[PDB]
Amino acid sequence: KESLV
C-alpha cells in the first residue's frame, strides 16, 4: 500500500 498524505 503506497498512499500520499
Place this chain on the structure above:
Amino acid sequence: RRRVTVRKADAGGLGISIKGGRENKMPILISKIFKGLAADQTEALFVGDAILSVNGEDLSSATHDEAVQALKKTGKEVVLEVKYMK
C-alpha cells in the same frame, strides 16, 4: 528508533508517501518524502521511516490505513514516532 514532529500549516499538503501494512509485518515505512512539504521540510521526516505512533496513536497495532488516517487528520503538531531503517 526516532522521534519527529511535523508542524501543520505551511504549503498545506504533508508531502509523504508511506509504504507497508500490518498485513505484512511492516511498521508503516515511508518510501517517498515529497520535497517542499512539512515532512521533508522539518529536517526529520525522511524516507526509510517506519512510523509506530502518530500524535500519540501507537500504530504498531494499526494497518496502513490506520496510519494514513492519522496523517490525514493530524493536529497542530504532527508528533510522529519513527523507526529509521537506514
